[PDB]
C-alpha cells in the first residue's frame, strides 16, 4: 500500500469497507477513483 489517492481513506463498517474523501465529504463503496492513486 497505498492504492488510494491523497485525500481518501478506508473506513471500517460491519457491512464492509467504504471509501471516504475527507476534503469533500464524499463516501462510496467503490475504490477511488480520483486520483492519482
Amino acid at each position: 500500500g497505498s492504492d488510494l489517492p491523497a485525500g481518501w481513506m478506508r473506513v471500517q463498517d460491519t457491512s464492509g469497507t467504504y471509501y471516504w474523501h475527507i476534503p469533500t465529504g464524499t463516501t462510496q463503496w467503490e475504490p477511488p477513483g480520483r486520483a492519482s492513486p
Binding site: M9, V11, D13, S15, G16, Y18, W20, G25, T27, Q28, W29
Partner: peptide, 9 residues
C-alpha cells in the same frame, strides 16, 4: 467518519 453510504442502484 461519516456513516456508511447507501448502495447504489
Amino acid at each position: 467518519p461519516p456513516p456508511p453510504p447507501p448502495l447504489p442502484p
